[PDB]
């Protein structure tokens, strides 16, 4: 189990008032992720801490991040958070007081550059505070080239590890500032109780990483210590023993392929095996206590069902520092309302601390792989209904009520009507030609946003699509209303009955049994579609075809999908016969 990347996670109550954590991943599952933490402190300060490979554990005042990228005007910096500096509103007032207070709060570490309006000085200060090799703070200042080198290195680092999912070049600094202002806006919205904090147990903001992702995470740290470091040490030793001008292209090659390949003593294979065997727990690489993000267990061959269930096991993430030893302990072990259809509601350990800790995929649930985000990005940016982020400003978004559009958590533009765009792209996905069937199209009606998700680790299950005649029903209602208004005695004769049903037929059941029909054919024909827990919040599902048949003419219960009831159980839970006739704890 892993929290969703490129997603703001907020946590209000349980001297820091609130925390907003955003982990940014520029591309697929194998890219380095940068974690930014935004904290409102009781002192009034809003601090942004960026944890990355380059540097971490440094809380910078929020306005300094905007100042380093050229946005030095306080009005423009605050405008990134409130989106309109000349709107009375009610959230705007509260946000403006908080931001004005946070600007003037004195910070112990960034005291000299707090009131600095020149971005070069702030960049230099951050470079000195961040660079490992700058242990002499005064010697280099005499050399102008040294200052330029530090500034360039810091700018490159900032472009690489500050919101890399929104871009990694210098062309997207202002877009990154807009996104950061949006994140601060969301955090302050939660602060004023407009929003509740992020549900830690909900699967709408959760991902499941197995094999490839976890092995890649372990492999990065193992490679950096077993290959890069030995080669660096060998090259250093060769240059210290042999004069640089004496190398004849043979010393370099042997030093490369003998420094790491003679005194291995740790091995890439041995370290990968240790990562696989240790499991999801804290471990020590190079005497550094890092957390192994690989969830593994011994293959206990009690039976074949045990092996299959082990291969379909979803494990909660383990962290040493907190491990959630509060009321959260029994909150995370409960059956969450987002589980049905994706996580088996019955499978769990019945004894010990492992009760509800280990989850099982439901029978029809699948793990999505990373889709081609680039094609959908090109389609969305070329969509006339979507105004690109470069062509719209915060004033236009807030005054015209524009709806933000996200793909894999990246804000790529705004649309006039979020619902229409979401429905049109859902229809395109149903066609399956220009939109891949495994993409998530989520519409947040509370804030009018459309989110496209194609990242790895998405739980997905196929759901039969329920279609209705609501348009014809509404037209008949309008015709009957016109007849009544004209003064007709049998105006009700124009009304038609409501019809909702699936297109699934017993003949397709026989074709599936005959092997001539597959789930891919059903998805291509539009009979069924794949639904993600985040997209499931946009769905109203009939729990069975019996329920759908009962409400066939019920215009007040317009299901979007119909479920097969056995899809809420895992393989081991389905072994129990008449499980719905048994107490569910006994099914566990």
């Amino acid at each position: 189990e892993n929290i969703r990347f490129n997603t703001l996670h907020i946590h209000y109550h349980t001297n820091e008032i609130i925390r907003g954590e955003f982990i940014s991943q520029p591309g697929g599952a194998f890219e380095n992720s940068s974690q930014i933490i935004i904290r409102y402190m009781t002192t009034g300060a809003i601090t942004i801490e960026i944890n990355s490979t380059k540097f971490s554990k440094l809380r910078i005042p929020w306005y300094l991040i905007f100042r380093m990228f050229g946005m030095t005007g306080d009005d423009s910096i605050i405008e990134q958070v409130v989106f309109d500096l000349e709107s009375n509103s009610l959230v705007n007032t509260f946000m403006i007081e908080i931001l004005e207070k946070s600007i003037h709060v004195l910070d112990p570490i960034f005291q000299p550059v707090q009131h600095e309006l020149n971005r070069e000085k702030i960049i230099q200060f951050l470079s000195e505070k961040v660079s490992k090799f700058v242990s002499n703070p005064s010697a280099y200042k005499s050399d102008e080239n040294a200052v330029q080198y530090l500034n360039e290195r810091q700018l490159t680092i900032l472009d690489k590890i500050l919101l890399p999912h929104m871009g990694q070049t210098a062309d997207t600094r202002v877009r990154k500032l807009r996104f950061l202002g949006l994140l601060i806006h969301k955090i302050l919205l939660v602060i004023m109780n407009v929003f509740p904090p992020t549900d830690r147990d909900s699967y709408r903001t959760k991902r499941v990483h197995g094999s490839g992702v976890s092995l890649a995470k372990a492999f990065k740290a193992i490679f950096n210590t077993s290959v890069i470091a030995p080669i660096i040490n060998g090259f250093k030793e060769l240059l210290k023993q042999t004069a640089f001008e004496e190398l004849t292209q043979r010393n370099i090659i042997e030093a490369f392929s003998a420094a790491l390949s003679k005194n291995t003593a740790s091995d890439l294979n041995r370290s990968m095996e240790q990562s696989i065997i240790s499991g999801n727990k804290t471990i020590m690489v190079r005497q550094r206590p890092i957390v192994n993000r690989v969830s593994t267990q011994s293959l206990e061959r009690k039976n074949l069902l045990n092996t299959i269930s082990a291969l379909r096991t979803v494990n909660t993430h383990n962290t040493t520092n907190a491990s959630k030893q509060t009321e959260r302990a029994d909150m995370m072990r409960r059956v969450h309302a987002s589980y049905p259809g994706y996580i088996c509601v019955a499978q769990s350990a019945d004894t010990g601390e492992k009760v509800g800790m280990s989850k099982q995929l439901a029978i029809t649930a699948n793990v999505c792989t990373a889709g081609e985000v680039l094609s959908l990005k090109q389609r969305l940016l070329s969509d006339p209904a979507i105004q690109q982020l470069a062509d719209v400003s915060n004033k236009d978004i807030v005054r015209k009520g524009l709806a933000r559009v996200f793909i894999n958590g990246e804000w790529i533009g705004c649309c006039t009507n979020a619902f229409e765009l979401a429905q049109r792209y859902r229809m395109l996905r149903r066609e399956g030609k220009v939109v891949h069937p495994h993409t998530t199209i989520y519409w947040d009606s509370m804030v009018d946003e459309v989110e496209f998700w194609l990242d790895v680790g998405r739980l997905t299950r196929p759901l039969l699509i329920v279609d209705n005649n609501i348009e014809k029903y509404n037209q008949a209602c309008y015709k009957a209303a016109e007849a009544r208004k004209k003064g007709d005695k049998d105006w009700e004769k124009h009304k038609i009955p409501f019809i909702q049903n699936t297109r699934f037929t017993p003949q397709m059941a026989k074709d599936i049994l005959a092997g001539t029909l597959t789930l891919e054919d059903l998805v291509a024909q539009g009979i069924c579609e794949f639904i993600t827990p985040e997209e499931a919040e946009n769905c109203l599902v009939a729990f069975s075809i019996i329920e759908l048949r009962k409400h066939k003419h019920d215009v007040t219960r317009r299901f979007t999908h119909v479920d097969v009831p056995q899809a809420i159980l895992g393989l081991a839970a389905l072994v129990s016969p008449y499980a719905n006739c048994t107490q569910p704890a006994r099914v566990t």
Binding site: D330, R333, L540, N580, T588
Partner: protein, 151 residues
């Protein structure tokens, strides 16, 4: 509630008063036993004989098995809308007012549970399992502290 006729007393919000009214309305009456005993030969029914003589089981067990489970209560309250804002499950609409959307199980165990009913029952059973699991640890902590304070 729809006509704005529910007036909470002093000390409760309309939501709390409505939840209390719903919890009181969905309790099984005493006459739920009448159909059960009309179908049961007490001089011959093994289940009734075990329940009535105190060997095993209780009246709620028989009622759940034969008539219906009823309202699923967790911490004295009904099922919370945790699926989304105002939604308890993907199977029920937002701001649903029916009792079934909030954990009321209308089916007995012998009749079989539907998928949402089974999900609510699984939530209750998982609560039971969690409480049983952490009872051992909490009792161990308290017992060790009390023993060392009193030994």
């Amino acid at each position: 509630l729809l006509h704005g006729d529910i007036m909470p007393p002093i000390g409760l919000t309309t939501h709390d008063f409505y939840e209390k009214l719903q919890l009181n309305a969905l309790k099984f009456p005493d006459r739920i036993l009448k159909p059960i005993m009309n179908s049961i030969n007490p001089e011959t029914n093994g289940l009734f004989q075990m329940v009535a003589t105190g060997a095993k089981g209780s009246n709620p067990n028989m009622i759940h098995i034969m008539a219906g489970i009823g309202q699923i209560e967790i911490n004295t309250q009904r099922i919370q809308p945790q699926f989304s804002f105002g939604r308890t499950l993907v199977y029920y609409p937002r701001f649903a007012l029916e009792a079934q959307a909030y954990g009321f199980i209308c089916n007995s165990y012998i009749a079989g549970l539907t998928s949402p009913e089974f999900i609510f029952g699984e939530m209750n059973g998982r609560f039971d399992l969690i409480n049983k699991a952490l009872s051992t640890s909490s009792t161990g902590y308290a017992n060790r502290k009390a023993i060392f304070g009193l030994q």
